[PDB]
Amino acid sequence: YLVSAMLLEIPYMAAHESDARRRMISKQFHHQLRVGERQPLLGPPESMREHVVAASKAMKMGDWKTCHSFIINEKMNGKVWDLFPEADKVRTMLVRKIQEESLRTYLFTYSSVYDSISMETLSDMFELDLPTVHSIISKMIINEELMASLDQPTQTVVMHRTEPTAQQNLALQLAEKLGSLVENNE
Amino acid sequence: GGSGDSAVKQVQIDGLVVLKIIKHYQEEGQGTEVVQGVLLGLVVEDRLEITNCFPFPQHTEDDADFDEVQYQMEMMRSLRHVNIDHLHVGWYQSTYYGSFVTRALLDSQFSYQHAIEESVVLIYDPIKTAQGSLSLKAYRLTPKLMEVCKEKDFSPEALKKANITFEHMFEEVPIVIKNSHLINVLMWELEKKSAVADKHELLSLASSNHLGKNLQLLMDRVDEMSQDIVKYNTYMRNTSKQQQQKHQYQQRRQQENMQRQSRGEPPLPEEDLSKLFKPPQPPARMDSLLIAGQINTYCQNIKEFTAQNLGKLFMAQALQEYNN
Amino acid sequence: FPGGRVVRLHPVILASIVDSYERRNEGAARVIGTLLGTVDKHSVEVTNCFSVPHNESEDEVAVDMEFAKNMYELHKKVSPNELILGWYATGHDITEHSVLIHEYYSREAPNPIHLTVDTSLQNGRMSIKAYVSTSMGVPGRTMGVMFTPLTVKYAYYDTERIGVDLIMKTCFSPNRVIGLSSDLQQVGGASARIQDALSTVLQYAEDVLSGKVSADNTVGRFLMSLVNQVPKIVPDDFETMLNSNINDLLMVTYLANLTQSQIALNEKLVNL
Amino acid sequence: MHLETRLVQLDSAISMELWQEAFKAVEDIHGLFSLSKKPPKPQLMANYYNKVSTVFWKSGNALFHASTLHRLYHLSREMRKNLTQDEMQRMSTRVLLATLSIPITPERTDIARLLDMDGIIVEKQRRLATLLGLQAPPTRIGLINDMVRFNVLQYVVPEVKDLYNWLEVEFNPLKLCERVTKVLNWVREQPEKEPELQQYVPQLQSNTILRLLQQVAQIYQSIEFSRLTSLVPFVDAFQLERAIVDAARHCDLQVRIDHTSRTLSFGSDLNYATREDAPIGPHLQSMPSEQIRNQLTAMSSVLAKALEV
């Protein structure tokens, strides 16, 4: 949930070539593969039902479905630490819920806010500054860092430049295998 | 002038045929490949003058199941009562694609042309092709394929037929060129919606003003192309990677197994020499998937030559017009 | 309310008229059938018809109705359009046979809605004329029916009607549909000739004395309507947007002719 | 013997929070009722339709909840022709029930699943619609407007007769945040005004945001949220901002999202691609301003041409 709902959101802009096919998808395939879906009861739904609303960041919709009746369902209490496993967990949520603006909500963002972004997610400002810092050196977002002002203009305009290269995603498979047909033949 | 290979002529679809087509245009089957009828023409000077064609009603709620031949047998009875006999000189669709030759319908087109060699199969294109180049495609199937019949078979009759190497696309005939005088009264309808009841002629020039402005016209087409060229192209190459996983990569190791044993024993068999060289599943070619692979990738490129020029002529127009 | 005001048929039935009348199968003068049409009970939305062989003379009356009922089953089975509305006949108009086949139509007993075919080279008389009748009481003679004329509307699917619009250009002189793009830019230029020849004379008429009368804020509003959406005012920022459009079509077009190469390139090393 | 006990199989499970077998139960009852078409239908389908209403309220989306309430409105008027419920307050109650359950959500987030076979559940929406008695899946306010064809916008109580005339037809980017919300509170009346019609306040919020934002975004092309925050004086502030960002990200409109100075201009034109109508249906009343694209020349040029001749 913390190495899937983050990792493959950077190549899931119709940019598939990092595919990990042993994950929640063992569940995610089958418990959206039905029609009548209301309040979750089991572990897998009561995990997936706020996973999908951790996807569309919703920073408290993602958290406060992991701390209702799980505590007696042997998630929170069952570990011989009461509020320290959740203090580990919900911190690990509050950090992977600024790293949602990173890959997800950056579309038509030309100006960006930073004081209020950590105040919104009620986290230590530096603790959510250092992973957005990580995202520049690791994820290399089409955005520009100027952190003496504590703002970043993005200039992210690949909006429909990315779709004729969605037609190149395959002209890659064209180009990959014409670098493989003679390997076949000769 | 308009002869193909020995038996066939071009087609001549006067506009009064075209209107019984576009009544069942892309509706009673929108995202459903309705075979929109059989081209009931006749054999006149250089041309298969189509006169009246009847739309065939596949059981269209969400799919297409083949309906009664009693329909076709009464539509032919019906046309015989006032019009020509059932001189079916082709069959026609549209139907929800810009310039595509459907393989299973190309087999329905093949056996149709083996039966009546004087046949061109129409692919109508309304504005769904984005307007767009070549709207009426009376695509007949190669007579060199109609020679090596039946049909295009997978492993045998592929190397044999692709040493004969029958063409993949052939004779997309010129259709409606001349004042046939069926015409008459739809001309006499122009001079009235040229005249004072002219509210309907402009509204056809309206289908011009809410086509462009708003419709993804490039993008959503290029996205559907962005889906078509990733699956079809990689699969043909997965074919053209699996075939020489077997053509050479196997026969590299098949002869390696054979040559190692000194190519048999003098006093006995030659047991494993008879056992070795067991032919792989594609030994040759796989020219059945591939021929229509040729057609449908070459068809990707007509859509592409469509997405070519349709484009250009906006980039011309809005760089032209804008600039004043 | 009057059921008969306007009958909404399109050139399918116009093609059903000519073809049925240009083969006939020895159809001397008069061909007839049962009209197929839907009813909004104010505007009569029509689509198809179907025809019969007749010996329509004096005093022999002939419309194969049972056959027209059975191909009504065909026409509805092929397309869920309509149900039978009346009789549709060739020239001449209202006489004794038209009402003796309305008897043959009251045999099945729906509300009658007709359509005459004009066999004449007139221009004043409209090519096609629909008909209803009131009174329509008639427990008397055969059928003393009081005929109302019905003006026609040519209103169905518009890419048909623009398909018609090029059938109008066939009608002028075909005009095959081969060079779609190249030739719809020729008629786009032809439209622009209509503009300049129209706009110049409606100017110079008011340079003389009292022009721009039917062209003050009619075409004056539609000069404004030309420039509403072509061209855009004079915005060079939007010309750059386009000049990047000139880049992406080149790409769409380049990808296009390369996958043309990728046909024979990949698909035919089968061919060795 | 069967259908009355198969609705216990349903009603008992939904009262004990069991939704997957509640869906199985609404499947079984309809599979049962299908072969009881041979006798004429008894007019006690309302209770089954009021249960599946209580299942689709949160299980399926309120597209399916409102659609089964459209069904329940129609068949319960059919009741009051034969049954004759001498009930004017009930007339108001069922018509307002339909109308308040209509404006819920504009567009679905089926792009968590787009990854693997997008066409599944959208095709399954037919399998839900056929259970409902629908032939095609549900569309939008066109439903309520071919049902103000009937006497509903007068049958509804003059508590909320007058308001829908502002939600849909009578539009203003300044005077509808202070039109909808007064009568939101006027129906918030919990105890005697059915305390079940109060779950529609946070979706009326959600709709009002993304709708009236389309309005403002097409009406003008630049107002700073420095005053838009108070210009929409609802019950929100920071989730208001983040729901404006939610309207931007899933693209009911396009505004340049995260402006610090809060000078958010909308832009022209650049994007009548995928995200103008969101996706195809128009949620704008006849305000929206103009844009240009490709063939648009032929169009109005050749329109305005052939009518004056």
PDB file of C-alpha atoms in Angstrom, chain B residues 1 3 18 22 38 48 72 89 101 117 128 141 149 159 165 168 172 176 186 192-193 250 266 286 290 305 313:
ATOM      1  CA  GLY B   1     -11.074   1.585 -68.637  1.00  0.00           C
ATOM      2  CA  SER B   3     -11.824  -3.628 -65.688  1.00  0.00           C
ATOM      3  CA  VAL B  18     -26.207   6.328 -50.941  1.00  0.00           C
ATOM      4  CA  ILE B  22     -27.002   6.551 -44.615  1.00  0.00           C
ATOM      5  CA  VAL B  38     -25.416  -6.352 -50.200  1.00  0.00           C
ATOM      6  CA  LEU B  48     -21.552  -1.872 -61.719  1.00  0.00           C
ATOM      7  CA  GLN B  72     -33.042 -11.097 -48.261  1.00  0.00           C
ATOM      8  CA  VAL B  89     -22.215  -7.286 -57.249  1.00  0.00           C
ATOM      9  CA  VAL B 101     -10.432  -4.369 -43.893  1.00  0.00           C
ATOM     10  CA  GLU B 117     -15.521 -12.548 -59.404  1.00  0.00           C
ATOM     11  CA  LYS B 128     -16.486   9.460 -37.966  1.00  0.00           C
ATOM     12  CA  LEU B 141      -9.728  -8.638 -52.525  1.00  0.00           C
ATOM     13  CA  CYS B 149      -8.445 -20.722 -53.149  1.00  0.00           C
ATOM     14  CA  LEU B 159       4.726 -20.169 -47.808  1.00  0.00           C
ATOM     15  CA  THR B 165       2.919 -13.680 -52.965  1.00  0.00           C
ATOM     16  CA  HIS B 168      -2.702  -7.779 -49.928  1.00  0.00           C
ATOM     17  CA  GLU B 172     -10.129   0.190 -54.571  1.00  0.00           C
ATOM     18  CA  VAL B 176     -19.587   7.606 -58.663  1.00  0.00           C
ATOM     19  CA  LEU B 186     -32.486  15.348 -56.304  1.00  0.00           C
ATOM     20  CA  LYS B 192     -35.521  24.705 -54.149  1.00  0.00           C
ATOM     21  CA  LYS B 193     -33.116  24.574 -51.117  1.00  0.00           C
ATOM     22  CA  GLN B 250      15.466 -24.003 -32.915  1.00  0.00           C
ATOM     23  CA  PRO B 266      26.594 -47.336 -40.546  1.00  0.00           C
ATOM     24  CA  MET B 286       2.957 -17.673 -40.807  1.00  0.00           C
ATOM     25  CA  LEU B 290       0.475 -11.638 -41.594  1.00  0.00           C
ATOM     26  CA  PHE B 305      -2.375   9.523 -44.156  1.00  0.00           C
ATOM     27  CA  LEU B 313      -5.209  21.707 -43.818  1.00  0.00           C
TER      28      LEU B 313
END
